[PDB]
From a paper:
The cleavages downstream of [name], NS4A, NS4B and NS5A are catalyzed by the serine protease domain of [name] which requires NS4A as cofactor for full proteolytic activity and is termed [name]-4A protease. In addition to its protease function, [name] of HCV and pestiviruses comprises helicase and NTPase activity.
We report here the crystal structure of a single chain construct encompassing full-length pestivirus [name] in complex with NS4A residues 21–57. To express soluble [name] NS4A37NS3 for crystallization, we used recombinant constructs encoding full-length [name] (residues 1 to 683) followed by the 8 N-terminal residues of NS4A; the [name] sequence is preceeded by residues 21 to 57 of the protease cofactor NS4A. Within a pair, one molecule adopts an elongated conformation (Zmax = 105 Å) similar to what has been observed for different flavivirus [name] proteins and the other, a more compact conformation (Zmax = 69 Å), similar to HCV [name] depending on the different orientations of the protease domain relative to the helicase domain. The overall shape of the pestiviral NS4A37NS3 is very similar to its counterparts from the Flavivirus and Hepacivirus genera with two separate globular domains, representing the protease and helicase, linked by a short flexible interdomain region that explains the different relative orientations of the two domains in our structures. It has the canonical trypsin-like fold containing two β-barrels, with the conserved Asp-His-Ser catalytic triad located in a cleft between them. Like in hepaciviral- and flaviviral proteases, the pestiviral [name] protease domain seems also to be stabilized by the insertion of a β-sheet from NS4A (residues 21 to 40). Most interestingly, the C-terminal region of the pestivirus NS4A, namely residues 41 to 49, hereafter referred to as "kink region", is interacting with a hydrophobic patch on the surface of NS3pro. Interestingly, residue 132, a methionine in the closely related [name] (valine in BVDV) and most other pestivirus strains is located on the [name] protease surface and makes hydrophobic contacts mainly with L45 of the NS4A-kink region.
Author numbering:
A (entry chain A): 1 to 29, 38 to 236, 244 to 399, 405 to 415, 424 to 732
B (entry chain B): -4 to 29, 38 to 238, 247 to 392, 407 to 418, 422 to 481, 490 to 496, 506 to 547, 555 to 731
């Protein structure tokens, strides 16, 4: 059925005919007459396609003996086309004849006229736009909102005569069906079959502005005639039609302006005085987008919330805020502030910051009152100039972070990704001892100390996978990837201490390796030296979730439970069901009794890296304990003296910790000591619950 | 149509495997992939594999619950000795041919006629017998023979893959008790993941020596150390220790037989173990039940303090003993006040949750919002004749509510359970017209008129097996919610209450779980003031607590609509009207207020036609329907019917809130919200 030759059966010559009222001419579906430069049929010629010609054209073969024909050797007319069993139209214009692709299939028109057996050659065809050109396209543009119409010389109007027109109105890239008065009209699309290919004329000018291609009907919308960046407009439509209690996940390229232009479009669509919130992890990131946006769009108000909480904030523009900003609020205050925003955008959720998981769970508790849109350039479980890919061997040449690299590339700009900061500094000074322009970068460093090193023709910077951003490399040539990183991980066991948190060196993510290779090739081609380390798939957020539990202590909220329910509705993060269950039991223990005031103040004032430790352990021990530091796998006589703890050294008496670190567990093991067992109903029940959860016994009773 | 669940699918036979007996001394190579012996058996060898020619339209029609028109019936004997593969919607099962006809499993066929599009054309095998208690569906008479204990059996799947990797694999069995135990060809106890056995139900089980049928593949069972088995059905001090060792944030479900003291001695034991001055709450649906148990308990255990909370809200209650309360008592509280009150109790006992009253579901979801702060324990608890139904056609028997009862039993005191009240009065006057001492009872009756002398379930033996309860329909066409009374089968527990009274029951089969959708809809009211989505809270609650069976689709739809209900603040006038009216479902006013502020009185329906009478409810300030149908979001079956009979039409959504709500309901069930035709 894709073989059929289109055959012109009727030719309707037409002339411009201005009428101030077209009511009697409209096609059967508040104020206005519908004045237009109508089309009047002056002649109706029937083509004389013979029986065999018709059947041959039906079976895809052009009848033998048809001569070509110029698309100008026609009267200004509308041509009825019958392709196999289907019906459509084409029309004449200065450039020739033009029709629709799904009507003609880009095939030559069979025209058996008074000029004989002829065929019009198809010069252009476009299936995406559904246009077919037998000549050069001459359709002129149309101003937005102008009234148009499409004329069918074979339809029956309200008056019951031959020749009916459907009035239109140009909106966006499509046309809207309206009556002669201008009321939005509805048409059953079956009542419009056989109209494709007809031209759309502007009412005032009587000039072609488009073709009849596709009909579309929405539930509450009137009938439309479609004509087939632009994706962002659809995104904004979907966002703005949201009802309170709905949630959308959006995947946007960073350059497409997920943080910048998307909220701007939304707020311009719903109203400049409506309140829209945009949550960003890093304070500096929120500040940057705030300055950039308020200087770029001076017509739209903006607000930045990264410092003290502004009580009773009702700021009208777009509010760029940090998650941690709202972590300063009690649960009822958080809800009262969140429901006042027309829309809430959760930015860069793929990052698992504790403030982020806490705020996401906490607001999901009242998600029924919110319109929530989560944005990322890279969702959960998503990897992301030409480039040479090298695989460097482990250890003419030189040694860079344990990899064999040829000395030639030391003439070029090199970025070496190394797991730890001690390794970063070590390799840095080892490289400067050999006579190279080396530097180092890790968490907490100033992006300016590197200015001295990067402002030179040859430089070699050794940095952690941490802070890929701040270093801003100029004209970077080669990257050396050790394939390793250093992240915090947690272990959960039914034996107290139930929680053990520590740094671990581990393989890099596949997508994160792609990010390390992403650095070179932006302005100039480059090369990569990669280890034989194989990447591992996914991100672990468990340590960050554990830390996020803190923001629920004052409100008595189980942040782990809130996260589980949130992720159930929103599907934003990969889940380890077992680990989430255990963490939820432990979090239940964490809020089981009011935190002592002394522990509260110590937690608020200390430079301890994981003050939640004090909270978990406070169910067994009131006195924090300083374990001896572990240097090179043995026990030392040094201690991490943190502020406000009023601690004691370990000695030979191991405290009954609920929460410990890998170095504390190691100190206990090396000292030949043992961890105490649970000492109250809370910790005993928590331990037996964790043990029951890790039940290897599976049993099932399924009706096959 | 669209997605409406899984109980509508028509079963369709897709393949027919004609088979013959095939004696083998060794069957090892044929076994299915999971001490001494070869496993000699009368196997089944596939002689023909005919593929059915069910057309696309037939397949989709059967998928949407309708039987394709133009199919002729077919005897279950006009088949080769064969195994029939069945596809009901998306699921797969089996049936088999035998002397008595065709036999299959209930959860595979649902007691529906089999659509069989064979070389014989469009045919149907009629289901003669159906049994949900067992796993039997009969297209004919069951002819399965017995089996001696411990005999070796097997089940053959002509499509499974054996150890040799060919089509047709068998699982060896051995009859133990009323079930079968899985073993290998040698006889070693075997293990099977039940997923590796899904789609095997309906296959026959054969005895090894005789090669004769002894049973069907119905249910799989797996225990920790036990081997895989094939079931033929779906299948105090310790309690107190487990309850009292609970940490805040834990939940326990307890099943206790009545009289063992689910409400009395369990909470009494718990509070006696934890301390007589600790506060324990016990929530009971009925106020009179709570008051009664309060009186009984405070008279029985005078050493323990007791409190009753069924009336006005006692603010800041710190009553030390056991507090018996109605759920509705705590429905008077805002969410923060509810939390403040609930966290002060050491334990909270949810009694008789199987009722699922609106107050019950509302309180359960609302408190589950802060379950992490709570310790929650949910608790739940003459000869039998089957009388035949009577038709339009008797001489020494008599007809009671559509049942054939012998006149002899009329010499005894009879209680007739009847679904509707009109049936109660009708059968009452027919029975007194025949010369009997008859009466009637239903909700609102005088307790003395019956003293002087057929009743609705509201009386809580001749059991019709039916009741009259409100049911709801959810559609993407506004009005999205339609609620009306419907006659329906009784639950198992309620039939047990009707048999509890002194038995002639109809051929009506009971249903396992109560339908709570209407009560959930009504329960949404208790979250309007707090701005809480009771449906969402219920879904999360039941996810954590696993207390009620769930219709995922219905819950999702109800959650979308409930989100619409809380989208904007309720108008003050609507709040006051809802508080003062005798309208039976005031949540209607709240839903409709998103389109219409003026309630509409629809004409009443008497005997299926439109009347000129109206239900004049208080405080509505309504208008008569007339010829102008309001754009209702929430309607009733009689309102929808009145619209249909009057030849009128329901309006479409008229604002972005209702339009988007409709678009969400359509997005569920996979309905296109836009259409794009090439003109």
């Amino acid at each position: 059925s894709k073989r059929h030759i289109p055959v012109v059966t009727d030719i309707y010559s037409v002339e411009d005919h201005r009428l101030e009222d077209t009511t009697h001419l409209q096609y059967a579906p508040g104020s206005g007459s519908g004045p237009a430069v109508c089309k009047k049929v002056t002649e109706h010629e029937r083509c004389t396609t013979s029986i065999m010609d018709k059947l041959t054209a039906f079976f895809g073969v052009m009848p033998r003996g048809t001569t070509p024909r110029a698309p100008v050797r026609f009267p200004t007319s509308l041509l009825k086309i019958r392709r196999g069993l289907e019906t459509g139209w084409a029309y004449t214009h200065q450039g020739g004849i033009s029709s629709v692709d799904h009507v003609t299939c880009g095939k030559d028109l069979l025209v058996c006229d008074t000029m004989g057996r002829t065929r019009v050659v198809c010069q252009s065809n476009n299936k995406m736009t559904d246009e077919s050109e037998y000549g050069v396209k001459t359709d002129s543009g149309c101003p937005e909102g102008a009234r148009c119409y499409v004329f069918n010389p074979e339809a029956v109007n309200i008056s019951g005569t031959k020749g009916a027109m459907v009035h239109l109105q140009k909106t966006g890239g499509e046309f809207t069906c309206v009556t002669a008065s201008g009321t939005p009209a509805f048409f059953d699309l079956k009542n419009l079959k056989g109209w494709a290919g007809l031209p759309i004329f502007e009412a005032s000018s009587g000039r072609v502005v488009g073709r009849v291609k596709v009909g579309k009907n929405e539930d509450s919308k009137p009938t439309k005639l479609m004509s087939g960046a632009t994706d962002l407009t659809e995104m904004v439509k979907k966002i703005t039609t949201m009802n309170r209690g709905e949630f959308r996940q959006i995947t946007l390229a960073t350059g497409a302006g997920k943080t910048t232009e998307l909220p701007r479009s939304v707020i311009e669509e719903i109203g400049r005085h409506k309140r829209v919130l945009v949550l960003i992890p890093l304070r500096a990131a929120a500040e940057s987008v705030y300055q950039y946006m308020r200087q770029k769009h001076p017509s739209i108000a903006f607000n930045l919330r990264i410092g003290e909480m502004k009580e009773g904030d009702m700021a009208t523009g777009i509010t760029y805020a940090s998650y941690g900003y709202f972590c300063q609020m009690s649960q009822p205050k958080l809800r009262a502030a969140m429901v006042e925003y027309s829309f809430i955008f959760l930015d860069e959720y793929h990052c698992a910051t504790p403030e982020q998981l806490a705020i996401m769970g906490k607001i999901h508790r009242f998600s029924e009152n919110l319109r929530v849109v989560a944005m990322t350039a890279t969702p959960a479980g998503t990897v992301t100039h030409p480039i040479e890919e090298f695989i460097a061997p482990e250890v003419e040449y030189l040694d860079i972070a344990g990899l064999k690299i040829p000395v030639e590339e030391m003439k070029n700009n090199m970025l070496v990704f190394v797991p730890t900061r001690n390794m970063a500094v070590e390799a840095a000074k080892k490289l400067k001892a050999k006579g190279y322009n080396s530097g180092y970068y890790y968490s907490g460093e100033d992006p300016s100390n590197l200015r001295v090193v990067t402002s030179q023709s040859p430089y070699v910077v050794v940095a952690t996978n941490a802070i890929e951003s701040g270093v801003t490399l100029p004209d970077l040539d080669v990257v050396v990837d050790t394939g390793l990183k250093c992240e915090k991980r947690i272990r959960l066991s039914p034996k107290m201490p139930f929680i053990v948190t520590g740094l671990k060196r581990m393989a890099v993510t596949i997508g994160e390796q792609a990010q390390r290779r992403g650095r070179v090739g932006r302005v100039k081609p480059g090369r990569y030296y990669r280890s034989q380390e194989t990447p591992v798939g996914s991100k672990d957020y468990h340590y960050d979730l554990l830390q996020a539990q803190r923001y629920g202590i004052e409100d008595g909220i189980n942040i782990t439970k809130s996260f589980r329910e949130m992720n159930y509705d929103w599907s934003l993060y990969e889940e380890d069901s077992l680990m989430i269950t255990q963490l939820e039991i432990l979090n239940n223990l964490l809020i089981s009794e009011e935190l002592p005031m002394a522990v509260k103040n110590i937690m608020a004032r200390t430079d301890h890296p994981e003050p939640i430790q004090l909270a978990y352990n406070s169910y067994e021990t009131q006195v924090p304990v300083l374990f001896p530091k572990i240097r090179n796998g043995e026990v030392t006589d040094t201690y991490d003296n943190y502020t406000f703890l009023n601690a004691r050294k370990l000695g030979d008496d191991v405290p009954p910790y609920v929460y410990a670190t890998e170095d504390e567990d190691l100190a206990v093991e090396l000292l030949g000591l043992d961890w105490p067992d649970p000492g109250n109903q809370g910790t005993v029940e928590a331990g037996r619950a964790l043990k029951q959860v890790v039940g290897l016994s599976t049993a099932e009773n399924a009706l096959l």
